[PDB]
Every structure is written in C-alpha cells, then in structure tokens.
Ligand binder design. Structure first.
Ligand SMILES: CCCCCCCCCCCCCCCCCCCCCCCCCC(=O)N[C@@H](CO[C@H]1O[C@H](CO)[C@H](O)[C@H](O)[C@H]1O)[C@H](O)[C@H](O)CCCCCCCCCCCCCC
Ligand SMILES: *C1O[C@H](CO)[C@@H](O)[C@H](O)[C@H]1NC(C)=O
Ligand SMILES: *[C@@H]1O[C@H](CO)[C@@H](O)[C@H](O)[C@H]1NC(C)=O
Lengths: 99, 244, 203, 275
C-alpha cells in the first residue's frame, strides 16, 4: 500500500448513438503492479477487453490502457471498475459522454 | 592468520549434545559447513552470509548453526546417532588480492558416534629396536612403533628424539589397520617407523620416544566400568641408544 | 552430477609429470577452481580461472581452461611424494559470493618413490620388554612391489610406507608385520606378498 | 530530437516461489519491444525493431537477456535471505540512453525497490542512492565483486545502447516523422455553479504528442483555460480534454484552438455555440 490508482474513462471518437467506437479506461499512477481491472456494461463485465502491456512512469508508478469495442446507445451506460490493494472497496468510475 | 576447528576428533555417546567449534580471524563474511563420508564427495550443509545469517544447504541434515559473531560459526547437533559419524569441514570465502573470492578450509572434525561408550579403548604403545642385522648391512637403524587396541580411530602419533619432535626419516600409516576386521566395532592398530644412521643409534646420549595422542572421553562423561576411564591422553614408549 | 573428473585414480613415479581432467555442464559458468585434499585434512585451493582467462600458474601446478568445450586440465610438473592427494574440481555459477559451488568427486593421485638402488630384506626387530609381539620389518624394496594384507585375526600386516631421510637424501619403503602367537617367525611372515626373488633373510 | 531509449522491467516475487518479470522498451513515445515472462525471446513490435543490427547481433543480445532474467530472479531471492527482506517484493529497472548530436551520449541504469530508488549503475560500478536504506550497502558490496556482470553492463550502456538507437533512428525514419491529424469537438459537462457553464473541448487522434489546446475569446488568448492530461488512445495516438468555467452570457464568441504539427499554418478553430 503506497500509491492509489485513478482512473480516467474516455472515448476514441465522438459519441454517436448506434455507431461503432472504442472505450478507453486509463489507470494511472499506482503501485504495486497488482491491479485488477474490469469494464462494466450496465453493471456487468465485458469478455473481450484488450489492453496495452503494463508500464511505469518516471516517478516509478504504473499505468495501463484498457480498451474495448462498443456501440454507444443512450439507453446503456458503461463503467470502469478498478480494484487494487490500496483502496478498500473496488472503485467504479462511470463514462461521461458530456465530460 | 587462518581459520580453525575444535576438536580434531570427537567421540560421543548416542543421545548427548554436540558442539563443533569454528573460528575465523580473516574478517571473511561468507562461511560454509561441509560434511564428508570417507571416500564420498563434499556435501554443503549450512552457509552464512555473515552478520546474523544462517541458511540450510543442498543436504537436509539434523544440525543447526548460529552466527552471533563474525569470528564464530558453531555447528550444533542435538540428537547424535551413528548416521552422524563423518568428517565435518568449516570454511570461509573472502578477498585475498586480485578479485575472485578464494575459499579457505579448516582442518576439520572427525566425529564418531558410538552406541555405548564402553566401546572406547585407549592405545597401548610399544617401541621396537633396530636389528643387529640391519645395522651391519645398510649402515642404518629403524625403530618401529606399535599403537595397538585403540577405539575409535582417533590418534596422532609422533616421534620424539632428545625431547624435540622430529619429522625426517619418519613414516606413519595413512590407514589404521583393523584388529578384528569381521566384527562391526573393532579396535585399531597403527604402525610407524623412525629410521636413523647406525652411528646415531649407537650413541647412549641419544634418546628416542614414540608418543600417541589419543582422543577419548571428557572428564564429564558417564562411566561405571571397572577399568580406567579412557580419557583424552598421550601414551608413550621409549628407547635408549644401544652401544651395539 | 554437473562436474565430472577423469581419471578416478592414477599412480605415477616421483619426479614425473601428469595431467588431470575436468569437465562441467554448469550454466551459467563463471569460474573453475582446483582443490588439493591431502588425506584427513582440509582442501587447499590452488587455482581460480574465469571464462575470461585460459591458464593459471601456481608454482608447480598449472591449470588450463576452455570455456568453449567446457573443459579444464590441471598439470603437475616434477611431482614429489607430497603430491599424493585427492584433487577436487569446483565450479561456480556466479562471479561473487552470491553463487553456488558444484564439487567434483575428485581424482585420487598417488606418487611412488623412484628408488634407483634397491636392497630388499626382512629383519627381526628386537622385542620390547613389555610386548611379546614378534615384529618383522620388510624394507628397502623398490616401488614395483606390492605388500598384500594378511589378517587372520592373529597376524597383522601394514601397507607399504615411504620414509624420507632428507639430510642423507635417502628414501625407503617399509612394511611391518607382527603377531602375538608363538607359531610366528619372519622367515615366512610375508609370503602372501610377492616379494623379490633376491630378498635378504638373516639368521 | 527527443528520442531516448527506455528499457523497462517489472519483477514481482509474491512469495518464496512465485515470480513474473515482464519488460518492455520505448523509443521516445513509441513501444518497440515487448518482453513477457512466458516468452523465451523479446518480441519485436515494429517492422524496424532491429536497428541496423544483424540477426546474429540480435541473437547475442537475445541470449544476454534470457540469461539475465533467470539469473536475476534467483539473485533477488538470495538477497532476501541475505538482507532479511519480507517477501511481498517489487523490483523495477529503467535502463537505456539517448543520442545527442555530435559525438556521444548519456546512459542510465536505475533499479527500484517497492517504488523507491535504491541503486544506479555509474560508470564502472553499482552506486546506492542518497535516500537508500543501509542494507543496500551490503547488496552493493556483493554486486561489485562480479566483474563480468559489471563489465557487461558497462558495455551495454556505453557501447550497445547508442549503436542500437542510432540504427533504430534511421531505420524507423519514416514512422518517427509521421503525422496523424487530430479531430476535435465540443460538449457540456456539469455546470460548476448556478448561472455558470462548463465549456468542454475534446481533442483525439494525434501521433506527434506535443500539442497545444487553449480556449480563446476574440481570436486572442484568454486565461481561465484548464487543460487535462494527455491520455493514450488504443491505436497509439493521444487525447486531450480542455475545460473553461465561464458565465453563460459570455459563452458567445468563445473558441477552442488546436495547434499541432500535422496542421501546417492553419489551425483547428471551433466556435460556441456548436455543441
Ligand atoms: C541496457 C540494455 C541494452 C540496450 C540495447 C538492448 C535493447 C533491446 C530491446 C529490448 C528491451 C528489453 C526490455 C528490457 C530488459 C531489461 C534491460 C536491462 C539490461 C540487463 C543487463 C544485463 C546484465 C547481464 C549480466 C548478468 O546477466 N549477470 C548475472 C549472470 O552472471 C553470471 O554468469 C555470467 C556468464 O553468463 C558471468 O560468468 C558472471 O560472472 C556470473 O555472475 C548475474 O548473476 C546477476 O544476475 C547480476 C545481477 C544483475 C542485475 C542487478 C540488479 C540489481 C539487484 C539488486 C537489488 C537488491 C534486491 C534486494 C531484494
Ligand atoms: C516466469 O517464467 C519463468 C520461465 O521458466 C518461470 O520459471 C516462472 O515460473 C514464470 N512465472 C510464473 C510463476 O508464472
Ligand atoms: C505465492 O503467491 C501466489 C499468488 O501470487 C499464491 O497463489 C501461492 O499460494 C503463494 N505460495 C506460497 C508459498 O504461499
């Protein structure tokens, strides 16, 4: 327990209802390496979610890009659940279309 | 200078505790403990990186080591059984000069664990005088020394001329010969020869003595036998220069 | 084992050369060492060479290394009796105290006296005033003779032993035979041994 | 030219007998190599990952790593025994160099224990960092005996590294100069106050990372611009967000301006309202 992850969710392209897109969840200044990251669709995790190889910033903290393929709809909300030895309960950050 | 061990030989009764002492002045940090059965290779049992560090080796033995002072690396054996009868070798690595950490070994401790102590016997010692025949043939004379009936094979024979230890003209058997070979706990025999000039044997001033340093029991061990407690001791026999 | 030595044991005459072999499979290899273990004593280190270096000269002993073929030879020049010893070959998988040492099971070398002027004989040694054990001394034979043990619980015979009179420059083998039984004399004490046809027996 | 090589390593050790040491390599901002603890080899992630280096030069290196990994993992395990370190462990290494114009370069090899610096390789030896605990001096002793490892490292930093980057630079030429044009839009996040508004400018899809986004009034700069982090896209591009806390009645006229290398003279200009 030293540096705690956080945790930014964003899109590759503009949000278009019923049009293919990518969802990026970036994490993000943590330590140690043992992170465990899930992407939620209405509260339920996605099977096909590829990432980049885990790497560390100059300050020795780690970071990961978690990306998926998805078609945004206004009836559906996507989220990113991150769990790590630092924070007690698994932290969730919603994807905000507006911000 | 150097690394040290105590004692050279140790015989203990199956059940008592065992301390094997190892000293090292060199200031070396890394230190080893090795075991060696007559003939077989060396097996590493314990090793210390120095300081306060003690680790097991590639052999899973019963002994424990401790390292509370750089200079000291005592091996302690709690149970003591026949299976522990070996030679035990202390060592240390540490820079001497150029770069690569040489390894320096102790003189070692030969342990022997017996089922009962009344197996232990000291050595009886005789000296045998050169023959008239040899003297007039080779112009030389050869004293022979017999150490007989000692168990265990825990002995250091030495030759003494005029009260000083001598080495030139001496032979002592590498292998102590077994008295009763077919038996499992036989006592031992050991022969040595000091050879000197015919003239030197003929001077009555010249005094020859053969002495055997037997490693036996501590004056702390249990003893209920009728005979004399076979303790650590020197046994001697001598001879005066015969006028021929 | 990962460190193999050849030969197992060899016998050479004093003042002659000889070469001992060592092959390893230790990976990663860093350094090879030669240890001389005189009987009933601790090993003494002689040479340490690295992947880098190919020959280390320690007085009369000289080591060779070929990290290419994972092979190291040791070479003794003008050998003497004090050479007779087990020679251990050790390999380290690190260039610091942080590595392990893999030991060979050793080559057993024996050096035997070159006796140019031999004179075998068996002498009856004057009995001690205590021990009524009659002691026979086979002596002054060259090294091409072996003394066989005969131990019928009543007769004792010790292996041959090389004695060095440095100040006269004389070296002599010897075997000692004794028995506490009356049916024992030196005229036939040895007999199990193949002793020289021209051995001297006095009366 | 800001194109340094960063050879990076993450070693784990959860307890006495579980370990993964995965690594990677960066040339500036791009990932060139990927070294998973499953693989015997370092995987090459680009058509130009081998510089001018021959297959046999690359084999020489491939071997040095394969040995380094395995040797490392046992050595760390022994240091734990030697230095009395409790076993949730985390080791990292950052090694490489950059090539300046003219003659030479500067190199580096830093290792870190539980995210704090412990030692670097300086010149010909290992050196402990200022803040480092005392048991480091003991490890550093044990390391500086190993002349072969020390000289190998020295050769890897002074010699191999800058020969490799020089190759990587010219055999990656066409991809390092490469340009990808950014796209930008406008949105409206939660209003920071009562009568106010939060203007939000998104920008994503640009490969030369060094970018410039600022909200502007009358074509000339304005101060309340609050830029975000420059976050990574899936397809090795970048995304920047920029927000302005303005009063509603003067959102009219405001403008998001984007200066990136892919755009020549012309810049990307977006006006409000056009959300
Ligand atoms: C720098 C890289 C060069 C640049 C060009 C290549 C780029 C290629 C692109 C791919 C990038 C891949 C991702 C990056 C991976 C990490 C890169 C870091 C470079 C690794 C340096 C390699 C050093 C090689 C030395 C080595 O393997 N030593 C081995 C083998 O040596 C043995 O065997 C040898 C024969 O093979 C010799 O006989 C030797 O005497 C014997 O001891 C040696 O046994 C040890 O592992 C030495 C350790 C080395 C690391 C020190 C780490 C500090 C740890 C202390 C921290 C305390 C921890 C307390 C809990
Ligand atoms: C990492 O790879 C090495 C290579 O054999 C292996 O020993 C180790 O167990 C691997 N890590 C784990 C536990 O997944
Ligand atoms: C070592 O760690 C792994 C998890 O990383 C665990 O599954 C395993 O049980 C641990 N082994 C020991 C020695 O407890």
């Amino acid at each position: 327990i030293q540096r705690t992850p956080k945790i930014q969710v964003y899109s590759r392209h503009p949000a278009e209802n019923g049009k293919s897109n990518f969802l990026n969840c970036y994490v993000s200044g943590f330590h140690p390496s043992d992170i465990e990251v899930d992407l939620l669709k209405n509260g339920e995790r996605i099977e096909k979610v590829e990432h980049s190889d885990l790497s560390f910033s100059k300050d020795w903290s780690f970071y990961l890009l978690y990306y998926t393929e998805f078609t945004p709809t206004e009836k559906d909300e996507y989220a990113c659940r991150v769990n790590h030895v630092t924070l007690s309960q698994p932290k969730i950050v919603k994807w905000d279309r507006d911000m | 200078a150097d690394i040290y061990q105590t004692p050279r030989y140790l015989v203990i009764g199956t059940g008592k505790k065992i301390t094997l002492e190892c000293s090292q002045t060199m200031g070396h940090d890394k230190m080893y403990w090795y075991q060696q059965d007559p003939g077989m290779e060396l097996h590493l049992i314990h090793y210390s990186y120095g300081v306060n560090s003690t680790e097991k080796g590639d052999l899973s033995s019963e002994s424990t080591v401790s390292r509370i002072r750089t200079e000291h690396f005592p091996l302690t054996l709690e149970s003591a059984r026949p299976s522990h009868t070996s030679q035990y070798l202390c060592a240390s690595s540490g820079l001497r000069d150029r770069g690569l950490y040489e390894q320096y070994f102790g003189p070692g401790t030969r342990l022997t664990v017996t089922e009962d102590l009344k197996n232990v016997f000291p050595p009886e010692v005789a000296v045998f005088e050169p023959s008239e025949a040899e003297i007039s043939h080779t112009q030389k004379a050869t004293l022979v020394c017999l150490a007989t009936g000692f168990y265990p094979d825990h002995v250091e024979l030495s030759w003494w001329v005029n009260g000083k230890e001598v080495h030139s003209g001496v032979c002592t058997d590498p292998q102590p010969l077994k008295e009763q070979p077919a038996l499992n706990d036989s006592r031992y025999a050991l022969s040595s020869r000091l050879r000197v000039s015919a003239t030197f044997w003929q001077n009555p001033r010249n005094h020859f003595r053969c002495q055997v340093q037997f490693y036996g029991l501590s004056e702390n061990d249990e003893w209920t036998q009728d005979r004399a407690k076979p303790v650590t001791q020197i046994v001697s026999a001598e001879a005066w220069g015969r006028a021929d | 084992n990962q460190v193999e030595q050849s030969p197992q044991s060899l016998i050479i005459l004093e003042g002659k050369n000889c070469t001992l072999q060592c092959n390893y499979t230790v990976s990663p290899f860093s350094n090879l060492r030669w240890y001389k273990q005189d009987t009933g004593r601790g090993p003494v280190s002689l040479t340490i060479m690295t992947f880098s270096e190919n020959t280390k000269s320690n007085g009369r002993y000289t080591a060779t290394l070929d990290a290419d073929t994972k092979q190291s030879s040791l070479h003794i020049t003008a050998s003497q009796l004090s050479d007779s010893a087990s020679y251990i070959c050790v390999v380290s998988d690190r260039g610091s105290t942080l590595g392990r040492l893999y030991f060979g099971r050793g080559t057993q070398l024996t050096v035997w006296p070159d006796i140019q002027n031999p004179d075998p004989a068996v002498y009856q040694l004057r009995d001690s005033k205590s021990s009524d054990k009659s002691v026979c001394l086979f002596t002054d034979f060259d090294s091409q003779t072996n003394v066989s043990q005969s131990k019928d619980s009543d007769v004792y015979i010790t292996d041959k032993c090389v004695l060095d009179m440095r100040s006269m420059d004389f070296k002599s083998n010897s075997a000692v035979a004794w028995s506490n039984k009356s049916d024992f004399a030196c005229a036939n004490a040895f007999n199990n041994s193949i002793i020289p046809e021209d051995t001297f027996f006095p009366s | 030219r800001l194109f340094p090589l960063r050879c990076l390593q993450i070693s784990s050790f959860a307890n006495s007998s579980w370990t993964r040491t995965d690594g990677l390599a960066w040339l500036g901002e791009l990932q060139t190599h990927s070294w998973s603890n499953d693989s015997d080899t370092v995987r090459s992630l680009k058509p130009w990952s081998q510089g001018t280096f021959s297959d046999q030069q690359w084999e020489t290196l491939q071997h040095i790593f394969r040995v380094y990994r395995s040797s490392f993992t046992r050595d760390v395990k022994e240091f734990a025994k030697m230095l009395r370190l409790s076993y949730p462990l985390e080791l990292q290494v950052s090694a490489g160099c950059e090539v300046h114009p003219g003659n030479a370069s500067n190199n580096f090899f830093h290792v870190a224990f539980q995210g704090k610096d412990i030692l670097s390789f300086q010149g010909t030896s290992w050196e402990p960092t200022q803040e480092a605990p005392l048991w480091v001096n003991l490890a550093i002793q044990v390391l500086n005996q190993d002349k072969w490892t020390r000289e190998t490292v020295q050769w890897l930093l002074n010699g191999t590294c800058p020969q490799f980057v020089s190759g990587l630079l010219e055999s990656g030429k066409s991809e390092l100069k490469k340009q990808v044009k950014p796209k930008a839009w406008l949105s409206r996040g939660p209003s920071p106050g009562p009568g106010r508004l939060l203007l939000v400018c998104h920008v994503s899809g640009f490969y030369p990372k060094p970018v410039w986004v600022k909200w502007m009034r009358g074509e000339q700069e304005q101060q309340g611009t609050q830029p975000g982090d420059i976050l990574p896209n899936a397809d090795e591009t970048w995304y920047l967000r920029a927000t302005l806390d303005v009063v509603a009645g003067e959102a009219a006229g405001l403008s998001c301006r984007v200066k990136h290398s892919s755009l020549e003279g012309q810049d990307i200009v977006l006006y409000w309202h056009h959300h």
